Amino acid sequence: GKQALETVQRLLPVLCQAHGLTPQQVVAIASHDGGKQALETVQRLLPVLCQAHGLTPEQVVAIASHDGGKQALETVQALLPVLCQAHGLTPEQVVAIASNGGGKQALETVQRLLPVLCQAHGLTPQQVVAIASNGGGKQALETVQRLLPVLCQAHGLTPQQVVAIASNGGGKQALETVQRLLPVLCQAHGLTPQQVVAIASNSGGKQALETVQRLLPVLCQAHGLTPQQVVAIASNGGGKQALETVQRLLPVLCQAHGLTPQQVVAIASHDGGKQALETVQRLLPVLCQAHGLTPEQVVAIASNGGGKQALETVQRLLPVLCQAHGLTPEQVVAIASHDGGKQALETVQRLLPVLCQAHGLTPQQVVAIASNG
Numbered sequence: 349g350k351q352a353l354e355t356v357q358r359l360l361p362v363l364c365q366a367h368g369l370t371p372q373q374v375v376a377i378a379s380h381d382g383g384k385q386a387l388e389t390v391q392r393l394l395p396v397l398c399q400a401h402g403l404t405p406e407q408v409v410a411i412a413s414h415d416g417g418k419q420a421l422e423t424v425q426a427l428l429p430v431l432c433q434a435h436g437l438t439p440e441q442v443v444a445i446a447s448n449g450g451g452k453q454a455l456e457t458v459q460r461l462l463p464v465l466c467q468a469h470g471l472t473p474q475q476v477v478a479i480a481s482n483g484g485g486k487q488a489l490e491t492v493q494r495l496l497p498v499l500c501q502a503h504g505l506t507p508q509q510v511v512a513i514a515s516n517g518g519g520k521q522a523l524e525t526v527q528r529l530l531p532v533l534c535q536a537h538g539l540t541p542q543q544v545v546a547i548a549s550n551s552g553g554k555q556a557l558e559t560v561q562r563l564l565p566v567l568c569q570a571h572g573l574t575p576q577q578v579v580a581i582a583s584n585g586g587g588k589q590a591l592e593t594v595q596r597l598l599p600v601l602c603q604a605h606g607l608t609p610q611q612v613v614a615i616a617s618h619d620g621g622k623q624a625l626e627t628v629q630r631l632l633p634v635l636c637q638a639h640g641l642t643p644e645q646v647v648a649i650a651s652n653g654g655g656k657q658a659l660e661t662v663q664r665l666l667p668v669l670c671q672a673h674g675l676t677p678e679q680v681v682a683i684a685s686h687d688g689g690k691q692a693l694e695t696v697q698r699l700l701p702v703l704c705q706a707h708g709l710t711p712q713q714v715v716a717i718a719s720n721g
Contacts, residue, residue: 386417420451488519522553624655640677
């Protein structure tokens with residue numbers, strides 16, 4: 349406490365000078381139970397681990413920066429060489445296992461269960477690394493060991509599926525939630541195991557599956573959409589929120605913008621679907637009123653990866669493109685309406701005035717070229 353502060357005064361200067369730490373990195377380390385010893389340990393181990401296994405000081409800091417920093421660093425030192433050699437791990441992988449807290453125990457557990465899990469269930473070191481590399485990897489590994497056989501017999505899940513469920517924030521929780529909710533989602537709600545797996549396989553599988561559980565009957569009966577569609581929405585990162593915003597925005601968009609739920613689904617069914625859907629609400633009126641677009645075209649634009657950014661740049665570029673190069677909004681829409689329409693519109697802006705001046709190409713020709721994958 350008082351000694352943790354004195355030690356920071358003592359070591360801050362030399363750790364920043366001699367190893368390139370920042371005061372912030374130093375504070376991150378001191379700001380845990382037993383910050384004094386944590387700091388002293390970084391000081392004496394950092395050069396060693398850098399020289400013996402090529403750990404950057406950034407990697408060392410990331411290990412020290414959680415409760416039990418001293419114990420986790422010591423354990424990396426004792427175990428990195430053997431883990432790397434015995435199971436083919438990179439130092440990088442060993443650093444990921446250690447840098448979430450309960451580092452010491454996470455590494456030791458990986459040491460214990462790795463050959464086991466790999467032989468019993470046909471797992472890969474890389475898979476057991478992934479399962480261990482988030483907050484709760486020790487618990488997560490035991491739960492995989494425990495539930496792996498349960499889920500693969502009861503519900504026909506594969507190890508790859510189990511691994512995918514256990515490898516994000518909260519592996520233990522996600523696995524147990526799949527175990528509890530799988531039968532229910534399928535038999536009461538008309539899902540398949542594969543779909544339950546897809547929803548679960550993301551940062552926040554637990555809440556995602558829970559949100560799906562509650563919004564499924566509402567969204568299906570009220571807006572006529574199917575489970576396949578609900579799963580498609582929920583099966584991307586940020587799925588829960590995506591579904592949640594579909595529920596509040598579907599009605600508004602359908603009634604006020606004459607969108608159909610089929611389209612709303614398409615918008616939401618990609619990464620950034622939540623922000624894409626949101627952006628559609630914000631920009632659709634301006635696009636229709638000032639830039640010559642129909643809601644239908646607005647949908648087509650939003651209905652790809654990064655629809656939000658694509659709409660935003662259609663709004664940005666359409667005026668220039670029409671005024672200065674004689675494009676129609678139709679033409680703009682045709683360019684923006686493909687995977688990477690955004691950058692495709694950006695390069696159309698760049699090249700148009702140079703191609704239609706040296707090769708008398710017509711704007712129509714450029715458009716024809718740019719309107720593809």
